Amino acid sequence: PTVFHKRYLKKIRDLGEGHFGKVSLYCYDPTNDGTGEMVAVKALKADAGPQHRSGWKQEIDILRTLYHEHIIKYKGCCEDAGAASLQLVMEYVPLGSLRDYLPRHSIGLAQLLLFAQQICEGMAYLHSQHYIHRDLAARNVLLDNDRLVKIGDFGLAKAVPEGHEYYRVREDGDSPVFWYAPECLKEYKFYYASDVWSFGVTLYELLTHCDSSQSPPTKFLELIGIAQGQMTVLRLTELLERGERLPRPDKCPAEVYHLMKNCWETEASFRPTFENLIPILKTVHEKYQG
Ligand SMILES: CCNC(=O)c1ccc(Nc2nccc(N3C[C@@H]4C[C@H]3CN4C(=O)CC#N)n2)cc1
Numbered sequence: 001p002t003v004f005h006k007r008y009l010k011k012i013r014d015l016g017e018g019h020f021g022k023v024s025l026y027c028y029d030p031t032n033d034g035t036g037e038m039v040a041v042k043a044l045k046a047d048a049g050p051q052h053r054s055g056w057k058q059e060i061d062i063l064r065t066l067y068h069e070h071i072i073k074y075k076g077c078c079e080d081a082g083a084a085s086l087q088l089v090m091e092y093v094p095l096g097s098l099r100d101y102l103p104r105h106s107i108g109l110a111q112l113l114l115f116a117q118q119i120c121e122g123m124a125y126l127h128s129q130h131y132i133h134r135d136l137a138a139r140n141v142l143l144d145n146d147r148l149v150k151i152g153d154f155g156l157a158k159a160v161p162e163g164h165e166y167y168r169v170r171e172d173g174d175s176p177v178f179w180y181a182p183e184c185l186k187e188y189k190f191y192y193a194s195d196v197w198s199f200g201v202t203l204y205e206l207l208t209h210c211d212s213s214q215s216p217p218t219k220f221l222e223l224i225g226i227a228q229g230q231m232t233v234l235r236l237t238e239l240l241e242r243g244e245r246l247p248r249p250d251k252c253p254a255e256v257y258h259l260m261k262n263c264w265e266t267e268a269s270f271r272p273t274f275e276n277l278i279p280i281l282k283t284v285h286e287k288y289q290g
Pocket residue numbers: 015016017018019020021022023040042090091092093094095096097100101139140142152153155
């Protein structure tokens with residue numbers, strides 16, 4: 001609903017670049033005085049195809065209507081005359097992603113489980129609104145403060161059709177395969193249960209403190225190798241079907257690894273839902289707290 005006027009927008013620094021977009025930090029100062037606001041602005045590249053351009057308007061409308069404590073706050077839009085589309089303005093989350101934060105801040109097991117619980121609440125809310133995320137990874141989880149986390153990007157999020165139980169994807173070149181369930185890699189079908197698999201991977205990233213050497217692409221690529229031709233995705237699919245999984249992170253409890261392994265059930269219907277995971281993480285969080 002809210003409209004940002006370009007004349008009060010001052011660019012500070014680039015924050016990141018996703019699949020089809022770019023996020024930059026801006027100062028929104030309607031004066032020049034100290035009552036300034038810092039804003040995160042998502043812009044689609046002016047080169048983006050007609051597929052991404054229609055998908056962009058849908059993403060804007062998705063953030064315009066999602067309202068939850070563990071979802072980044074939509075602020076408004078402004079005309080991106082330079083790209084003929086709009087720019088998505090959101091709140092600026094100063095501590096960045098868990099992928100950015102965790103490698104430098106040794107966070108305790110208790111806070112990590114609180115974050116995992118918060119991602120589940122945000123994801124159960126998203127699923128309640130009949131949307132699938134399709135890009136749940138630690139790089140998309142933003143740190144508001146030491147005790148608050150928010151899902152910060154919806155670049156691949158899609159409305160699940162009323163009658164259907166899944167969304168048909170048709171695999172691209174930028175798909176985050178190392179976060180995907182076998183049904184996604186194989187049948188090009190994304191279920192609500194496919195987001196739970198990606199959550200399991202996010203939970204693994206968190207328990208490894210987002211260590212780049214322990215990362216899902218790093219670990220899976222060690223299990224597949226790099227002389228595969230066009231076959232990385234096939235070898236990944238066959239390893240996941242043989243029951244090979246990401247290892248137990250150093251200092252990760254056995255029960256948390258078992259929960260991770262449950263989000264990684266090959267059969268999608270055997271996975272818990274985000275609604276089921278909330279009481280479980282709540283309870284597992286209360287335990288490690290004391
Ligand atoms: C040098 C290390 N960087 C940091 O520590 C740092 C990074 C971001 C940041 N604040 C911030 N606020 C709001 C949103 C937001 N992003 C939305 C997603 C995830 C992140 C970038 N994204 C995209 O690019 C999506 C596309 N396309 N990031 C503050 C600090």
